[PDB]
Tab-separated table of C-alpha atoms and ligand atoms in Angstrom:
chain	number	residue	atom	x	y	z
N	3	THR	CA	4.933	102.234	52.371
N	4	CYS	CA	2.319	99.480	52.132
N	5	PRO	CA	2.043	97.750	48.742
N	6	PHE	CA	-1.318	97.674	46.963
N	7	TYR	CA	-1.700	93.903	47.153
N	8	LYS	CA	-1.938	94.083	51.032
N	9	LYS	CA	-4.858	96.560	50.854
N	10	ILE	CA	-8.565	95.574	50.778
N	11	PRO	CA	-10.420	98.340	48.713
N	12	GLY	CA	-13.662	99.656	50.129
N	13	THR	CA	-12.597	98.846	53.660
N	14	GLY	CA	-10.386	100.215	56.390
N	15	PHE	CA	-8.501	96.885	56.332
N	16	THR	CA	-4.983	95.591	55.576
N	17	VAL	CA	-3.598	92.034	55.503
N	18	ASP	CA	-0.166	91.003	56.811
N	19	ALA	CA	0.974	94.714	56.828
N	20	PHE	CA	2.812	95.278	60.122
N	21	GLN	CA	6.228	96.561	58.837
N	22	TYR	CA	5.081	99.835	57.320
N	23	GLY	CA	4.441	101.841	60.511
N	24	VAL	CA	0.943	103.328	60.802
N	25	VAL	CA	-0.896	102.665	57.500
N	26	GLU	CA	-2.966	105.663	56.391
N	27	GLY	CA	-6.650	104.994	57.037
N	28	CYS	CA	-6.234	101.419	58.311
N	29	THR	CA	-8.718	100.795	61.143
N	30	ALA	CA	-8.019	97.052	61.512
N	31	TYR	CA	-4.972	94.904	60.754
N	32	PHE	CA	-5.642	91.275	59.813
N	33	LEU	CA	-2.920	88.627	60.329
N	34	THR	CA	-3.314	85.378	58.318
N	35	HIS	CA	-0.696	83.267	60.166
N	36	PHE	CA	2.310	83.417	62.571
N	37	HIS	CA	5.213	83.389	60.087
N	38	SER	CA	7.851	86.160	60.394
N	39	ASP	CA	7.590	87.586	56.808
N	40	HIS	CA	3.912	88.109	57.597
N	41	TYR	CA	4.005	89.278	61.257
N	42	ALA	CA	7.160	91.485	60.812
N	43	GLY	CA	6.671	94.622	62.957
N	44	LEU	CA	4.312	93.360	65.694
N	45	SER	CA	5.429	93.667	69.415
N	46	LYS	CA	4.112	94.608	72.945
N	47	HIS	CA	4.034	98.255	71.809
N	48	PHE	CA	1.452	97.672	69.035
N	49	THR	CA	-1.813	99.530	69.873
N	50	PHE	CA	-4.208	98.894	66.927
N	51	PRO	CA	-6.733	96.049	66.763
N	52	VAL	CA	-5.332	92.772	65.278
N	53	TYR	CA	-7.787	90.214	63.873
N	54	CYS	CA	-6.607	86.568	63.561
N	55	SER	CA	-7.351	82.964	64.559
N	56	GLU	CA	-7.398	81.748	68.194
N	57	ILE	CA	-4.080	79.929	67.621
N	58	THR	CA	-2.407	82.997	66.024
N	59	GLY	CA	-3.743	85.003	68.991
N	60	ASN	CA	-2.092	82.574	71.495
N	61	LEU	CA	1.243	83.134	69.763
N	62	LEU	CA	0.875	86.932	69.644
N	63	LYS	CA	0.242	87.062	73.408
N	64	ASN	CA	2.869	84.556	74.501
N	65	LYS	CA	5.683	84.861	71.977
N	66	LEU	CA	5.588	88.564	70.924
N	67	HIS	CA	3.895	89.862	74.159
N	68	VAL	CA	1.179	91.780	72.321
N	69	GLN	CA	-1.297	93.070	74.848
N	70	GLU	CA	-4.509	91.182	75.193
N	71	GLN	CA	-6.794	94.220	74.713
N	72	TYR	CA	-5.611	94.544	71.100
N	73	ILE	CA	-5.930	90.827	70.126
N	74	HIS	CA	-9.262	89.958	68.517
N	75	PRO	CA	-9.421	86.212	67.870
N	76	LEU	CA	-12.302	84.957	65.621
N	77	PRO	CA	-13.775	81.433	65.287
N	78	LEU	CA	-13.368	79.675	61.942
N	79	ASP	CA	-16.228	79.037	59.548
N	80	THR	CA	-18.364	81.682	61.229
N	81	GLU	CA	-19.871	84.896	59.807
N	82	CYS	CA	-18.505	87.785	61.959
N	83	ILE	CA	-18.936	91.646	61.748
N	84	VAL	CA	-15.734	93.732	61.943
N	85	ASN	CA	-16.064	97.591	61.731
N	86	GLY	CA	-19.325	97.128	59.861
N	87	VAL	CA	-18.136	94.560	57.300
N	88	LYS	CA	-18.991	90.838	57.315
N	89	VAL	CA	-15.948	88.519	57.305
N	90	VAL	CA	-15.253	84.831	57.515
N	91	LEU	CA	-12.043	82.967	58.395
N	92	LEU	CA	-11.425	79.621	56.676
N	93	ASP	CA	-8.765	77.005	57.220
N	94	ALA	CA	-5.767	77.581	54.901
N	95	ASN	CA	-4.150	74.077	55.210
N	96	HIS	CA	-0.802	75.840	55.832
N	97	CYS	CA	0.749	75.854	59.412
N	98	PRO	CA	-1.259	75.768	62.679
N	99	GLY	CA	-3.684	78.723	62.942
N	100	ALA	CA	-3.278	79.788	59.307
N	101	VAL	CA	-6.411	81.206	57.728
N	102	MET	CA	-7.864	82.508	54.469
N	103	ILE	CA	-10.178	85.583	54.801
N	104	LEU	CA	-13.514	86.178	52.938
N	105	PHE	CA	-14.609	89.877	52.898
N	106	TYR	CA	-18.217	90.863	51.920
N	107	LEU	CA	-17.848	94.510	50.862
N	108	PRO	CA	-20.783	96.876	51.485
N	109	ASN	CA	-21.166	97.486	47.686
N	110	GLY	CA	-21.682	93.701	46.992
N	111	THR	CA	-18.151	92.703	45.903
N	112	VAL	CA	-16.828	89.533	47.530
N	113	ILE	CA	-12.988	89.173	48.046
N	114	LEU	CA	-11.001	86.007	49.066
N	115	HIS	CA	-7.433	86.557	50.404
N	116	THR	CA	-5.792	83.109	50.660
N	117	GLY	CA	-2.923	84.119	52.937
N	118	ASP	CA	-0.410	81.306	52.570
N	119	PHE	CA	-2.269	78.070	51.618
N	120	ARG	CA	-2.084	74.546	50.289
N	121	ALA	CA	-5.125	74.184	48.078
N	122	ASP	CA	-7.267	71.075	48.700
N	123	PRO	CA	-10.509	69.760	47.251
N	124	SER	CA	-11.971	69.869	50.773
N	125	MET	CA	-12.033	73.606	50.394
N	126	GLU	CA	-14.712	73.174	47.659
N	127	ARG	CA	-17.184	72.377	50.556
N	128	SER	CA	-16.554	75.212	52.985
N	129	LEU	CA	-18.610	78.480	52.948
N	130	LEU	CA	-16.863	79.255	49.616
N	131	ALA	CA	-19.281	77.054	47.784
N	132	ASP	CA	-22.307	79.325	48.547
N	133	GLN	CA	-21.390	82.441	46.514
N	134	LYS	CA	-19.470	84.122	43.871
N	135	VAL	CA	-16.003	85.699	44.486
N	136	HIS	CA	-15.045	88.715	42.412
N	137	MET	CA	-11.360	89.173	43.462
N	138	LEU	CA	-8.795	86.534	44.615
N	139	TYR	CA	-5.539	87.545	46.313
N	140	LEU	CA	-3.609	84.332	45.631
N	141	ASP	CA	-0.587	82.658	47.232
N	142	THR	CA	1.356	82.032	44.004
N	143	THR	CA	4.584	80.637	45.633
N	144	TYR	CA	4.764	77.583	43.232
N	145	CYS	CA	2.901	78.954	40.219
N	146	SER	CA	4.810	77.032	37.514
N	147	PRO	CA	4.311	73.471	36.179
N	148	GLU	CA	7.836	72.427	37.173
N	149	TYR	CA	6.592	72.522	40.779
N	150	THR	CA	5.379	69.020	41.493
N	151	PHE	CA	5.600	67.236	44.859
N	152	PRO	CA	3.917	64.280	46.599
N	153	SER	CA	1.016	64.406	49.028
N	154	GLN	CA	1.791	65.111	52.655
N	155	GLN	CA	0.533	61.593	53.497
N	156	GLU	CA	3.101	59.842	51.122
N	157	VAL	CA	5.927	61.931	52.587
N	158	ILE	CA	4.971	61.031	56.179
N	159	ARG	CA	4.703	57.364	55.152
N	160	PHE	CA	8.252	57.548	53.783
N	161	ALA	CA	9.600	59.216	56.922
N	162	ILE	CA	7.874	56.808	59.422
N	163	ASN	CA	9.100	53.682	57.587
N	164	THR	CA	12.638	55.120	57.207
N	165	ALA	CA	12.903	56.020	60.920
N	166	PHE	CA	11.289	52.756	62.142
N	167	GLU	CA	13.658	50.648	59.997
N	168	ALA	CA	16.774	52.460	61.183
N	169	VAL	CA	16.070	52.407	64.914
N	170	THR	CA	14.939	48.721	64.776
N	171	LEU	CA	18.255	47.797	63.058
N	172	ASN	CA	20.158	49.991	65.574
N	173	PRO	CA	18.491	50.708	68.972
N	174	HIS	CA	21.331	53.176	69.644
N	175	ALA	CA	20.523	55.505	66.685
N	176	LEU	CA	19.090	59.049	67.433
N	177	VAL	CA	16.583	60.686	65.099
N	178	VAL	CA	16.908	64.470	64.633
N	179	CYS	CA	14.416	66.762	62.813
N	180	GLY	CA	15.144	70.324	61.752
N	181	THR	CA	12.755	73.272	62.396
N	182	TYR	CA	12.743	77.134	62.092
N	183	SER	CA	9.140	78.291	62.320
N	184	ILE	CA	5.787	76.705	63.120
N	185	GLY	CA	4.507	74.302	60.463
N	186	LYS	CA	5.318	70.714	59.477
N	187	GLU	CA	4.820	69.385	63.035
N	188	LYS	CA	3.448	66.120	61.582
N	189	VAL	CA	7.013	65.116	60.459
N	190	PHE	CA	8.396	64.891	63.963
N	191	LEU	CA	5.148	63.905	65.751
N	192	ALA	CA	4.581	60.898	63.434
N	193	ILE	CA	8.196	59.666	63.790
N	194	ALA	CA	8.089	59.936	67.663
N	195	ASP	CA	4.734	58.059	67.671
N	196	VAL	CA	6.058	55.033	65.624
N	197	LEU	CA	9.161	54.866	67.876
N	198	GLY	CA	7.114	55.205	71.158
N	199	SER	CA	9.143	58.239	72.192
N	200	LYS	CA	8.353	61.857	73.136
N	201	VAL	CA	9.917	64.615	71.040
N	202	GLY	CA	12.660	66.490	72.849
N	203	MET	CA	13.373	70.152	72.242
N	204	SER	CA	14.484	73.535	73.670
N	205	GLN	CA	12.354	75.462	76.127
N	206	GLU	CA	11.567	78.177	73.532
N	207	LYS	CA	10.304	75.648	70.967
N	208	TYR	CA	8.275	73.773	73.632
N	209	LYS	CA	6.621	77.141	74.542
N	210	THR	CA	5.680	77.782	70.895
N	211	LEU	CA	4.171	74.307	70.591
N	212	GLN	CA	2.138	74.741	73.831
N	213	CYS	CA	0.286	77.684	72.086
N	214	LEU	CA	-1.076	75.527	69.195
N	215	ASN	CA	-4.133	73.652	70.706
N	216	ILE	CA	-2.805	70.277	69.453
N	217	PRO	CA	-4.764	67.507	71.290
N	218	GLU	CA	-2.817	65.231	73.664
N	219	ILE	CA	0.328	67.414	73.251
N	220	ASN	CA	1.543	67.025	76.826
N	221	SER	CA	1.620	63.334	75.777
N	222	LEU	CA	3.961	63.977	72.708
N	223	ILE	CA	6.578	66.652	73.549
N	224	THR	CA	9.137	67.347	76.302
N	225	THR	CA	12.150	69.468	77.339
N	226	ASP	CA	13.921	66.469	78.924
N	227	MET	CA	16.279	65.575	76.112
N	228	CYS	CA	17.766	62.585	77.957
N	229	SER	CA	14.449	60.746	77.928
N	230	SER	CA	13.729	61.267	74.155
N	231	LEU	CA	15.087	59.526	71.019
N	232	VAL	CA	13.620	62.130	68.643
N	233	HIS	CA	15.286	65.554	69.019
N	234	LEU	CA	14.348	68.860	67.344
N	235	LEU	CA	17.106	71.275	66.375
N	236	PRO	CA	17.264	74.575	64.461
N	237	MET	CA	17.294	73.985	60.697
N	238	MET	CA	20.762	75.575	60.463
N	239	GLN	CA	22.271	72.888	62.643
N	240	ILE	CA	21.079	70.113	60.169
N	241	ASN	CA	24.545	69.539	58.538
N	242	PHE	CA	27.448	67.109	59.229
N	243	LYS	CA	29.343	69.504	61.651
N	244	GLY	CA	26.195	70.567	63.585
N	245	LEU	CA	25.107	66.966	64.012
N	246	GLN	CA	28.588	65.571	65.017
N	247	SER	CA	28.590	68.279	67.703
N	248	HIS	CA	25.087	67.340	68.908
N	249	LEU	CA	26.079	63.672	69.061
N	250	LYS	CA	29.094	64.585	71.292
N	251	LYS	CA	26.647	66.202	73.725
N	252	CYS	CA	24.503	63.092	74.195
N	253	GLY	CA	27.320	61.426	76.212
N	254	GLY	CA	27.591	58.022	74.472
N	255	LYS	CA	23.911	57.170	74.597
N	256	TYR	CA	23.884	57.059	70.783
N	257	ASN	CA	26.324	55.994	68.057
N	258	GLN	CA	24.426	57.048	64.846
N	259	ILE	CA	22.196	60.001	63.721
N	260	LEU	CA	19.409	59.785	61.203
N	261	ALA	CA	18.320	63.418	60.385
N	262	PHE	CA	15.464	64.910	58.378
N	263	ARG	CA	15.279	68.358	56.669
N	264	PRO	CA	11.745	69.112	55.557
N	265	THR	CA	12.228	71.575	52.706
N	266	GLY	CA	9.581	72.867	50.279
N	267	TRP	CA	10.329	72.026	46.632
N	268	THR	CA	13.849	71.157	45.448
N	269	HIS	CA	14.818	70.298	41.723
N	270	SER	CA	15.333	66.590	42.613
N	271	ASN	CA	11.419	66.619	42.411
N	272	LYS	CA	11.690	66.912	38.570
N	273	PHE	CA	13.548	63.531	38.384
N	274	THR	CA	12.984	61.441	41.532
N	275	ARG	CA	9.887	59.796	43.136
N	276	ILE	CA	9.481	59.913	46.932
N	277	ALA	CA	10.015	56.117	47.018
N	278	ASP	CA	13.471	56.662	45.407
N	279	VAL	CA	14.845	59.351	47.816
N	280	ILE	CA	18.253	58.673	49.340
N	281	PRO	CA	20.264	60.431	52.041
N	282	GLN	CA	23.591	62.220	52.074
N	283	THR	CA	25.917	60.187	54.333
N	284	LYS	CA	29.198	60.851	56.179
N	285	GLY	CA	30.293	58.116	58.519
N	286	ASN	CA	27.641	57.398	61.139
N	287	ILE	CA	25.486	60.473	60.109
N	288	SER	CA	22.747	60.381	57.392
N	289	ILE	CA	20.569	63.421	56.227
N	290	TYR	CA	17.335	63.099	54.244
N	291	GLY	CA	15.772	66.153	52.447
N	292	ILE	CA	12.025	65.390	52.280
N	293	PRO	CA	9.595	67.530	50.123
N	294	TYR	CA	6.966	68.233	52.768
N	295	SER	CA	5.148	71.283	51.328
N	296	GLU	CA	2.678	73.605	53.048
N	297	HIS	CA	2.022	75.508	49.772
N	298	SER	CA	-0.095	74.499	46.773
N	299	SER	CA	1.599	72.514	44.028
N	300	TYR	CA	0.969	74.021	40.485
N	301	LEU	CA	-1.777	71.418	39.770
N	302	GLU	CA	-3.541	71.959	43.197
N	303	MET	CA	-3.459	75.763	42.673
N	304	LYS	CA	-4.892	75.442	39.103
N	305	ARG	CA	-7.730	73.131	40.238
N	306	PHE	CA	-8.762	75.572	43.036
N	307	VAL	CA	-8.723	78.600	40.783
N	308	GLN	CA	-10.620	76.819	37.931
N	309	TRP	CA	-13.255	75.731	40.571
N	310	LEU	CA	-13.599	79.215	42.109
N	311	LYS	CA	-13.741	81.154	38.740
N	312	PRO	CA	-12.779	84.564	40.134
N	313	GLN	CA	-13.157	87.614	37.904
N	314	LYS	CA	-9.747	89.095	38.781
N	315	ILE	CA	-6.611	87.493	40.347
N	316	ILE	CA	-4.009	89.488	42.309
N	317	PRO	CA	-0.764	87.495	43.119
N	318	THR	CA	0.846	87.975	46.548
N	319	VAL	CA	4.105	85.999	45.948
N	320	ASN	CA	6.833	86.322	43.275
N	321	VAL	CA	5.597	89.819	42.473
N	322	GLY	CA	9.022	91.537	42.399
N	323	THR	CA	10.180	90.730	38.815
N	324	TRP	CA	8.579	91.395	35.425
N	325	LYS	CA	9.479	87.936	34.165
N	326	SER	CA	7.612	86.376	37.157
N	327	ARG	CA	4.616	88.591	36.810
N	328	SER	CA	4.415	87.880	33.055
N	329	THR	CA	4.668	84.105	33.553
N	330	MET	CA	1.917	84.094	36.196
N	331	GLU	CA	-0.531	86.170	34.051
N	332	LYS	CA	0.033	83.741	31.163
N	333	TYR	CA	-1.023	80.804	33.368
N	334	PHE	CA	-4.062	82.653	34.704
N	335	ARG	CA	-5.196	83.279	31.086
N	336	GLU	CA	-4.631	79.629	30.071
N	337	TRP	CA	-6.695	78.479	33.062
N	338	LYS	CA	-9.510	80.876	32.271
N	339	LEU	CA	-9.721	79.819	28.547
N	340	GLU	CA	-9.444	76.111	29.320
N	341	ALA	CA	-12.339	76.219	31.849
N	342	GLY	CA	-14.432	78.885	30.002
N	343	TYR	CA	-15.107	81.564	32.668
Z	401	NI	NI1	3.796	81.056	55.564
């Protein structure tokens, strides 16, 4: 059965609710982004209308073979009417095609569902600025002050300089980057660009990337591994055994691997600056964990909420334990009293 925090009251609508079978009285299913926890249940057999971004619609059609007659892509930043209710999709600053959804209920309530997001001050000048929001369904993944991490830009700077240094010292080093879902494409694209290489990858990952409307992409990616010095592998193969094995397969073209694992937060963020990050090394293999986040830090989340001043907040993440729930409500209250709404 569908949980309450995936239901939009006063509408026939649900959000990211595809694993519950037919939801009672749902006339349209919204999908915020193509990540498996969110799309779980969709397939070629799905026969209700799905509302999403253009990019999420490309992935539905090509990766999950959802039939075209049930995919309803909407433009961003545009007022649209769905089953008699005005909606707007806004960029979520998460992975490609990820949106937030603004619902204008017939009775005059306004609801913002963030989907998964990384809050940014640029959001303070979208269509959000123009009106009041009564209810916020909030991505609370890192809703605790221990969750600090650098900007995306600082992390990319670190990775580019690291990769460029290594390959200039050793023209026979291979760079490998781990992946398991869409998102974080900038890590491997920026490295391949500084090295003047294309990124090499499996046919299935190349297909996924071809759905994302990235400009000049035929210029940046390839399935010919032999011509590339930046390879993508599944995240699970980013360990000393998986990488030794990959190196065997390259047939003596390379004698060193420099590998990156983009994680979200890890506790080494509470002690270490990005400048100070060091790899784990075994022989001719090094592995860097880099804190490239596509979710709000605690401070970024707080700033967005204190700007928006919603009347009620409903968390969508970390909702399964009483200790989590209690902690989150305490921070929402602090934020409200500090800013005076
Ligand atoms: Ni996500």
